[PDB]
Amino acid sequence: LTVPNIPLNNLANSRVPAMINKMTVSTDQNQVVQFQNGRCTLEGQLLGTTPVSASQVARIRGKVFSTASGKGLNLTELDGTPYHAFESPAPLGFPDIGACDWHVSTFKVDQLSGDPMSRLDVKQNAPFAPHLGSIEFTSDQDPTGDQLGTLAWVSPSTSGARVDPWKIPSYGSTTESTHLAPPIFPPGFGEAIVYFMSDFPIVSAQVPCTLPQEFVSHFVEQQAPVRGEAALLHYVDPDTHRNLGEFKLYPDGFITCVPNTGGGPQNLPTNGVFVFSSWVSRYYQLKPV
Amino acid sequence: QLTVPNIPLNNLANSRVPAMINKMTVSTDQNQVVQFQNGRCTLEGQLLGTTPVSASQVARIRGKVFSTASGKGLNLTELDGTPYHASPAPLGFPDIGACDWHVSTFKVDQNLSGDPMSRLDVKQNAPFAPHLGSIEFTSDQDPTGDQLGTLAWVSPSTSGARVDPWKIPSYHLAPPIFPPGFGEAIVYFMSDFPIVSGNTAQVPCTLPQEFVSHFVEQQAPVRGEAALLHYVDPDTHRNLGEFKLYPDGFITCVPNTGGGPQNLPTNGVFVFSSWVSRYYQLKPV
């Protein structure tokens, strides 16, 4: 097993198209998340809506439809092939920033003149049910046909709400089975989930993810056998080659540390490289960072 | 030993625009020389031109707005906000030449309400001097401060002009790539992208972005004049075609007459086979 020999600041967020600019732990270290993107086991099994490439992250493709009530997209995978609702919550790469309005900038796939972009404004209201294969939108432009695009920004669902990018959508319409990647639980003994943060335009400031996207593709690519209960990593300064801290990478595909009281990995340099050290017991006792 | 990514072509990103690869092709004129500044990396992992490591750094721009009596523009920085020192441009800077760019940016600092996006409309005329650290733009919005964003679409420089995404800007340059050997054609990895010219509807690049990061990551020694690759169906394990990967960081094939790699399925995986001679003759594909 290896992890990417790439400094953290050259790694991409797995939940928005952006670069990671820092690590942190959640304010409440007992907080449980259930992100659907950035999810992959160490053996290379993609979970939830997680795609392989950073350029599949938080993107949408579909064919425009129009009814008496308004317009929407009948969803496909990002390559235009049929969406696998039977096994995933939404097309691979579909955004997972819950409980907010989305603004998605799309273009028509077969394109002679004029502004080609449409901004699709999507609400996560009662009828938002991407697992069933469609979403509705409003737009100040006139999108038609096969539209492909990327999440541009997010905003509050209602005037005066806030956006909490730590939430995920409700993919179903009702008891509807949506095939969610399971929750990630802080594993105990003072360990905290490490969140990789990126700047992103959130109107009412950073989006967390649990694996850098290149870690995901690395695991898919290697299909490495898991030879222990956890993988001990060192976070190494690439210029001085000093070990800046110990981290644990778990088979289910997330990373923890023991944050120093009043601190944590948010106080570490953001240009370090994670390096696999050894397979260890689930209860390997980390030095605080 | 040298390896290439164990990832099917349709899960690989373009290295010149933020998009996925959806086919391979050869140039209409198989003698055509290109000089792309992104997607450039040697097999040993040496980045060239403006090529960044991550797919989410491809064709992005960051800088501080200046807006004066004389004009508006960006004083460019690197994508992480650190100073750009006058390489052709900051890493990741777009390399789609001879066209207007439309770049959608947000204020990194922003703590205000409202539409956070600005579309920066950029022309490749006189004030376009990214090598010197600035470009000018017009915008129907009001961007201020530290703006970070991504190339959204491109359009003709002048009314009636066409956009040719095989061109690069006038900005250090990564060197031209000349079709090598006998009968070989450079393989171009294509992505759909909003180009508002004619029927063009595509972007070529010479290395998938994940190939670039793979080489940077691996730093493998070059042990021969060229690496023979097989393009393999990952389910049946059949070899679908022979390709040659050159140390300077590009791929060739010998296309069957009237055809070529554009006829191959896009779910195949490149696999290193062996080191071969610079004049190893490929099986037509």
Ligand SMILES: CC(=O)N[C@@H]1[C@@H](O[C@@H]2O[C@@H](C)[C@@H](O)[C@@H](O)[C@@H]2O)[C@H](O[C@@H]2O[C@H](CO)[C@H](O)[C@H](O)[C@H]2O)[C@@H](CO)O[C@H]1O
């Ligand atoms: C005059 C009109 O009907 N539209 C103007 C835009 O031009 C149209 O859309 C552009 C993208 C091209 O497809 C034109 O052929 C078409 O008429 C014009 O858009 C600007 O076009 C410039 C070319 O002269 C250039 O590409 C520029 O980047 C682009 O923004 C806009 C902006 O001036 O004005 C419309 O009225």
Ligand SMILES: CC(=O)N[C@@H]1[C@@H](O[C@@H]2O[C@@H](C)[C@@H](O)[C@@H](O)[C@@H]2O)[C@H](O[C@@H]2O[C@H](CO)[C@H](O)[C@H](O)[C@H]2O)[C@@H](CO)O[C@H]1O
């Ligand atoms: C000045 C004004 O009335 N602007 C309206 C937009 O609302 C502003 O910008 C949004 C993003 C929020 O920051 C508001 O607090 C601010 O007044 C409005 O934007 C829409 O806001 C909705 C929330 O009520 C929701 O987030 C929606 O997704 C977003 O588009 C736009 C669109 O209705 O209209 C402007 O006039």
